[PDB]
């Protein structure tokens, strides 16, 4: 079955018929850092080689129009750049200058102002281009989405009874010793619907409660946590029994958002649970054990669940039993 979101977090959507494609060029920086690495590294190589060529020809051109080329056998003549024997030497000086290596076998001189104003322009644009590209690299290396790689979601969501309440539970973890700051968990139920009046709504998102009113959706996440959605009157699973579950066409999107401790930058880790990955009547297997001075987590057991005695009834039907029980 098709899902909206993959277990690893990527989203199965393509944006077609974007009539106004120039917008991608309007915020070029976003397109650049969003590219695949091969394409950054390609552009990176190109941006540098074309500038050095582009200036290299302008350095050659000053030397040509000046007549430096024509008098190389005459020492009386002095050029813009000492030693520009040909079209190759210009390329090298062009790099020697803009990288600011400037070996100084090729050296500029007093004799032309035409050259000085180029060295000037170059150095300036050399800084602006170099910023743009190095900046682009730094951002791409340091970007926070990468942290998501050391944030795990449990492979299944489970439904079982907890202190008399029927609960939907998934487990989350963080493989690093460092932290997710201002950590928080939110969850969205994704399923299509139809209004009384006729409107079909493709992949309708309804927020699932996972601590919003108590601030228990704000996580302190060191050892793995089991996030619990209590299936109450206000739940979208209120009228879903063990029987009905597999015949429902729904998907739970789970989103973990906080700041990578070292870069202040906010990360978003995502995963999905489709109807078949929601185990009814199950419990997560413990992972925590005590050792001398430290609590040790056993990630082998992180995804593992086991079965428990659990009603087949919808949460709603459990209430109906309770209403008669308290009234008895």
């Amino acid at each position: 079955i098709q899902r909206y979101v993959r277990k690893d977090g990527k989203c199965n959507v393509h944006h077609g018929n974007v009539r106004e494609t120039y917008r991608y060029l309007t915020d070029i920086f976003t397109t650049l850092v969003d590219l695949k690495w091969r394409f950054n590294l390609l552009i990176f190589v190109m941006v540098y080689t074309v500038t050095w060529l582009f200036f290299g020809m302008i350095w050659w051109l000053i030397a040509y129009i000046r007549g430096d080329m024509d008098h190389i056998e005459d020492p009386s003549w002095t050029p813009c750049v000492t030693n520009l024997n040909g079209f190759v030497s210009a390329f090298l000086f062009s790099i020697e200058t803009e990288t600011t290596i400037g070996y100084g076998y090729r050296v500029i001189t007093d004799k032309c102002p035409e050259g000085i104003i180029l060295l000037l322009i170059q150095s300036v644009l050399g800084s602006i281009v170099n910023a743009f590209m190095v900046g682009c690299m730094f951002v791409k290396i340091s970007q926070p989405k990468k942290r998501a790689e050391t944030l795990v979601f449990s492979t299944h969501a489970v439904i079982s009874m907890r202190d008399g309440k029927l609960c939907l539970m998934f487990r989350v973890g963080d493989l690093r010793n460092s932290h997710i700051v201002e950590a928080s968990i939110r969850a969205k139920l994704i399923k299509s619907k139809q209004t009384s009046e006729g409107e079909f709504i493709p992949l309708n998102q309804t927020d699932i409660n996972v601590g919003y009113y108590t601030g228990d959706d704000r996580l302190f996440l060191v050892s793995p946590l089991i996030i619990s959605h209590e299936i109450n009157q206000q739940s979208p699973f209120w009228e879903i029994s063990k029987a009905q579950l597999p015949k429902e066409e729904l998907e739970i999107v789970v989103i973990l958002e906080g700041m990578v401790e070292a870069t202040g930058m906010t990360c978003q880790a995502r995963s999905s649970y489709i109807t078949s990955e929601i185990l009814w009547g199950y419990r997560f297997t413990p992972v925590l054990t005590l050792e001398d001075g430290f609590y040790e987590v056993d990630y082998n057991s992180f995804h593992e669940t086991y079965e428990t005695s659990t009603p087949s009834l919808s949460a709603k039907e459990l209430a109906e039993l309770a209403n008669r029980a308290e009234s008895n």
Copy 2:
């Protein structure tokens, strides 16, 4: 008619009679990065050329006061900077030094401490100025407002019935495959008012509810979303019928705020719906279709709406019909 906010997000306000203009110089960095590009690139060129000139004259000056200029025919004499034949050579050494190209035809020496302490000062201020300016460039290129270019708002807001409730709806979209992290939507109604007591309040902002109490204002925005404001008792559209709408003098400001995935930086995309852009009795045309392995969006249809059967009554009058219907 005059609007407060343009559809593209820019705001029609000018800040006149700012008596204390020095404040703009107090936080210079904000003024700089807020400038138009022509003016950054201008200042950028200028800041660099004046330093190189300013030092170039000081390099010339040491050479003049020392008497290096007077003895160029004497090799016994050795200068601060080998080869400073005139006022031009000094400018070149000044750049050769501060860019740190340092071709080394112009080379400093032991003979003057006067020169060494300059090379010292220069290099230090060369780093501080270079930071300030390159930094200023980097910030301006990477700034998040730019993302707003690949965030679209629907061209109209529509009002129609949804599961028995009258709703104001606008649609939002994101043209990129990358994400808006900690995405959230808020909306402000802008219209003037008068208190019982007499006070006129120019462009009074009252927050429009778009999910605040359920956290459904926190968006997971991949494919386009239709943001719904339920027009209930607490709504500012409670007493507005189809008839009255066009004769109201109001404007809805819509604000999308989240973090650009790659730079942790927060973006704010804005748009406005003036009274004439609010289509009563309309529905948004679907955009989502299924393809092999991927959900495809059709942005051609993004802004498109169609008409449906919809009451001409205000939400309030619909309730009055319901009160008698339930009491019947």
Copy 3:
């Protein structure tokens, strides 16, 4: 009278008897960027001059222990660094190397590995020190608190009647065309108190409501806004009449927090209203006027207020009149 917070935002508190002062050295970066500019620029100059000296002596030392110094009249002998005639030349090479100007009159050679491993160490530490310091500069220039300079608070808070409710109002503004993203306003009442049991609490902070439950504390701030605190049953001004106000010993701290549009960084602008700056029975003078295509703000009038007819009674006593009025 002593205030806790100045009108410009600075806080009248000193942190004395910090026994564990090393902590300031533990997070050195915070102390550095928190310093006055004179002291950054001082340290900046020093950090660079001591490294260049420190290496300069090590460059001199290799040259001394090797015996390069003793043979300068012998060309057969070749040194670590060509041309190190004395203790001054070493300082210059040391800079020429670490700034990477490297004029190359002073050039390293094959003949000693002792020199190569220094050039190596230097270049590496040259990058680490240069990062630390340039970074420190960049941060300090770009820091967001500076924006606060172009965020104004009204000079007074006023109390007057608004649609039958008694309200405490202050006005806020933003002098720039650019934005404060995720803008929000919160306000704290600061006054001492005593518990029934005996405990004196020095400067007790109680949050003042300014939109928290409706999200109207989240500002869209283009033209100036009048922030309104409705003085209701839950207000700390519930039992304060015009008469009692000046004899109360209290201070309202007002805090504006949002993100500078260009740097994603969060700014905090603060101000205070002491009991004497709270004008009872007053209204803010309008500032907004319409011009062709643009709304123009008149900051001359920003702080200005005028008097209106307003009850001398506490909000509580107004309710008591209303209770008998509705019961009549």
Copy 4:
């Protein structure tokens, strides 16, 4: 007794049996900046020395395959790099080039394109590697967790009566004159539990209320603040008397999260109070005193508490006395 969180903020947990260790390499930047300094500085040294060697051999190799090595006695022959007498000179040119010191005793030439395309590759990768590493340093120096060093938590939590309510109180402070922006305090109670149905939950986190519904959890923190948790019906200390406290097996985790004023980056300071550090019947000793123009804090007294008359009863039992008192 074992705690979950240390008083200084570090967490007693180890992540064992991480089967998928490659993920650490997938987001390498996080692993790098998370390393101990010795290991950054080690890698930093290594990354640079291996590139310079790696290129140095390629520079040597071009010189070898070309036959430059074989003709050093022939001036007719001209090499890729003037002066590459051996395997050592190549290493030096390799650094001279990539650091961009380029002393220019070793200079590239026209004669080989083989060399030019290397200089090209090098300079490009020289920028990418240099970014990666300097960036990594900058991040690590500027990271916000460090601020936590100048944020103190009181050594004990105390329980005493405040205006008729039994309260759990701890005190927090900030040693710097600079601010924590968007400051906020949250607190989690950590103790194991067992569901009716059988499920043991290892270290169950239940959020402790410390201002969430009034926004008094949002701190304006200049002088020290006493954070108060009112022990009401909804409290986890509702049924805990002075008698029972020490026999409970619980731990309160306290978390302070806000932005370092200068870097926009968010900091998280943590501490813990185990059952024995919760003083029943105690009050914090004042720290604030007035001086000419400034409020002075006395951090000697910051942690100090003193005893007061305080009920031995649980908050619940105090209510039961009140129920009969009001009914009397």
